[PDB]
Design a binder for this molecule. Sequence first.
Ligand code: HEM
Ligand code: HEM
Ligand code: NA
Ligand code: NA
Lengths: 150, 150
Amino acid sequence: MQSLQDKASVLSGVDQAEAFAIDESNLFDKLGLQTFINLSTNFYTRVYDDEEEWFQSIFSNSNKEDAIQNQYEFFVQRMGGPPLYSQRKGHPALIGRHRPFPVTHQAAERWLEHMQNALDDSVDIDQDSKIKMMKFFRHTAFFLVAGNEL
Amino acid sequence: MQSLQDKASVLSGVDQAEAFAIDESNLFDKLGLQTFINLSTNFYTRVYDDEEEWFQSIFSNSNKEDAIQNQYEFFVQRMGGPPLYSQRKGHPALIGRHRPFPVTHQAAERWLEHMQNALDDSVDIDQDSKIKMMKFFRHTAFFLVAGNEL
Ligand code: HEM
Ligand code: HEM
Ligand code: NA
Ligand code: NA
């Protein structure tokens, strides 16, 4: 309430401080490009095989392989790697770029569920990193929810 | 047209490639924190002394010293320095965070004018950097205009 990052914390239960703990060490240096590519691939397989119509139909106007490229490049860029996303698309502008979608509370949890699963399948992400990443995903999911409202 | 970064290029005359040339070398390493603090201070002095009512009244609900802190921290973060902005506020989410303001074509040029002046007064920014920075400011100003429309 009264500030996007505040709504995100209240809704998500993740403190903004926690959310950006990713910035304390270079995760990309820890995990490498391939971890991120596999992660987003896994994630989007699940999304595009999601049987939950309402979710899934959210992604109908996008290409699976494009969305994968969009996502891992943002993650690579944002977690210590080279700025691949900006090189190609400019500012992440997450709220702006999610404007066309119905980013609801329920949708945030669905998104986060597929991601939790994709993170679990990941063979190359250590616990500490998994926690930091989920804290970041979860805070920002609800940051998007807050943005979808205002 | 059809894509935020495309509108920005068409309106602004700055190719998105040009806009993100800042990512080729560490500008923060070149210029240091103080350059950025002085730059934003200069800039916001001008903004808050702007006699153009319509512009200036855009910034009425903000504190001069807060806006300065917001801006130089984003620039520091985005041009090679430590992620000060995110540490404090989370995602830059530029379109989202400019939603409350009337970000018009005319406003973009005004903003860019004060910035051009502030860049000129800067004693520690070399030509090459000035060009890269203005390309980045100008592209992103119109990216914000595009965002203000859609
Ligand atoms: C709240 C639940 C969310 C929903 C329903 C959602 C939905 C979508 C959809 C439909 C797209 C377009 C796919 C594409 O063509 O690239 C997209 C793009 C994207 N999403 Fe999400 N998203 C959510 C949360 C998140 C979160 C938590 C992150 C980051 C941690 C994120 C980052 C992105 C990025 C980087 C893109 C690509 C932007 C672009 O290049 O256009 N999203 N999202
Ligand atoms: C298009 C012309 C623009 C107008 C009229 C405009 C207006 C504003 C206003 C009124 C604020 C709130 C001040 C504050 O309290 O921090 C603001 C914040 C900000 N603007 Fe702009 N702006 C423009 C373009 C830009 C450009 C080109 C950039 C980056 C290159 C930028 C980056 C920011 C940032 C980082 C903030 C602080 C966000 C926050 O923490 O809430 N703006 N802008
Ligand atoms: Na942004
Ligand atoms: Na953003």
